[PDB]
């Protein structure tokens, strides 16, 4: 028994619905970057969280 870990992507329930699940998940990065600007222009609520 081994190798049990997988996620779908940026459309998963873990990213879209942090509160409507197990204790809130965590994910982030540094601000003032291209990835931060892209995720802010794409997913407002995800960035706010």
């Amino acid at each position: 028994e081994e190798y049990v870990d997988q996620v779908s992507g940026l459309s998963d329930k873990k990213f879209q619905r942090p509160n409507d699940f197990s204790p809130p998940f965590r994910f982030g990065t540094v601000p003032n970057g291209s990835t931060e600007r892209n995720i802010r222009n794409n997913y407002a609520e995800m960035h706010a969280y």
Binding site: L10, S11, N38, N42
Partner: protein, 50 residues
């Protein structure tokens, strides 16, 4: 099963000189930066039945 090799992407073909070339070359980048391509992928490719 296996590892990728000779990873070359697809593309839209056209003649040697045409404004439609640059138009499509900009529209594809805009779609990629917007999210349309991700929706198309998750709709027509990401079946995930197993």
């Amino acid at each position: 099963t296996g590892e990728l090799f000779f990873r070359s992407g697809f593309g839209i073909g056209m003649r040697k000189d045409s404004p439609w070339k640059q138009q499509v070359s900009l529209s594809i980048l805009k779609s990629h930066e917007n999210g349309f391509m991700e929706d198309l992928d998750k709709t027509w490719v990401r079946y995930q039945e197993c």
